[PDB]
Amino acid sequence: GRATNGQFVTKTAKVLRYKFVRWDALLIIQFIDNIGVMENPTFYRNKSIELRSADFLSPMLNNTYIVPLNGGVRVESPTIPVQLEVILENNSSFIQVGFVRLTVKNGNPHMIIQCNPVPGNIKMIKIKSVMLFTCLIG
Amino acid sequence: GRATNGQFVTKTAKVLRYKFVRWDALLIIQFIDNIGVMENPTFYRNKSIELRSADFLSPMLNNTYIVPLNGGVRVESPTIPVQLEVILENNSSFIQVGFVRLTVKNGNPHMIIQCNPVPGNIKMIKIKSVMLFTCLIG
Amino acid sequence: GRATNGQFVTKTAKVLRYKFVRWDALLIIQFIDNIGVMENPTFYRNKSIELRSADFLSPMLNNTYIVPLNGGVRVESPTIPVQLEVILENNSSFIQVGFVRLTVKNGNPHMIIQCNPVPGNIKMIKIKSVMLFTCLIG
Fold this sequence. Notes:
It is classed as viral protein. Chain A is built from no helices and 12 strands. Chain A is mainly beta.
């Protein structure tokens, strides 16, 4: 088909836009809010999906941050690695390879974000990567 | 099509289950043994594909562990990065970004797992990520 | 369809070959120059896409190396993580998880390669991973 627009909404009413394509048992979905661009002939700017502390569930265990989501599609995706910037309450920040999945719980989609230990409490996680999941349905 | 079940079997008779879809020149395959789940409203549990020392070929060079496989499909996949937990003979363990491919040798599929140096001999590698390969056939 | 051959060419006339498949809004493209192989029953050899200093734009900022490309297809791909070997002018080298995208600027495709800080100036980046992008067109 052609690519259909859609979105998820976070606990704090942040809107995560995506485009998707669904064929037989296949669902391919890309998040489109942070598609980086070259703004001139020589500079590439990354864009962030910015996820705040209030977007995550509590308690968090094992450097696993869970973003309950409302609306959009309901998939058990594979894991994709992303560029993360993990910002602490003290404004210190750590660049990490994160690992992201979409999963379903209580009929709600949730985004699972896993990363490494940091010396403090998290204020914000920024996903600097353009995320696309290829998923198998059923 | 709809997603067809299948599996590979390791040298020690471990069974690695997958689902796949094959269209024109495309083969998309997901391993399904370790699909993590939220077990309650607040806890996500990762599941592991556990690969033992006896599943790998010897000698191993350059932190490259090769798992000869029997049965299933025969593809030259791209490389996917995964979450690994590399467990040493002394029960010490290291969390790593691994890189995985499927390749064919002697008409047998083999899984290529590459990671970083560790201070010791490996007893076990656990893949904590949900793996899906998108492959081009011919 | 079946997989169509194609290529990009770098500023220094290096040829990057790929195969691709284009369906409705989907474009899937794999680079094929560095498909690793088992050369015997026990040894896997990685192959490199080797990108020289002269293939990149200047100035480089924020450990972002941009390879202007000519020919081939024009896509805004998602980000894929790769195995990189970053070789310095002093022949010292660092193994890294890189992050790669294809982007379009001035109607030209460009390959965006992002990695970590290194103690020196870069002579060469080797991509040791088999790269495939799944892309959404429009």
